[PDB]
């Protein structure tokens, strides 16, 4: 189904750097953190070669 929207969001101009991941990132699913609070399995963290 299709609609006109008058308001719209934007993506920024991305970096031109030759970035890579660092290490070989792999994530778990988890129901709890180390404190016993929920974990948002929808997101995770990685290291990259430069801050671009």
């Amino acid at each position: 189904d299709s609609y006109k929207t008058d308001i719209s969001g934007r993506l920024p101009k991305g970096s031109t750097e030759s970035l890579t991941v660092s290490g070989q990132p792999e994530h778990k699913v988890e129901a709890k953190d180390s404190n016993g609070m929920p974990v948002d399995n929808r997101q995770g963290t990685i290291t990259v070669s430069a801050s671009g």
Partner: protein
């Protein structure tokens, strides 16, 4: 084994037991209620006579 989420069961309606003041001395003292109009006109002080 399974790994399941942990909730907090807080019973907000059901307080644990708690302390009181018994008020026995001031429950036994004599009471007086001068009129609030009279006390306003008097500037919050009243006076009672002593015997000769």
């Amino acid at each position: 084994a399974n790994q399941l989420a942990k909730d907090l069961e807080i019973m907000f309606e059901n307080y644990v037991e708690g302390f009181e003041a018994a008020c026995v001395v001031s429950r036994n003292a004599k009471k007086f209620r001068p009129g609030d109009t009279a006390m306003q006109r008097a500037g919050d002080v009243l006076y009672r006579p002593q015997h000769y």
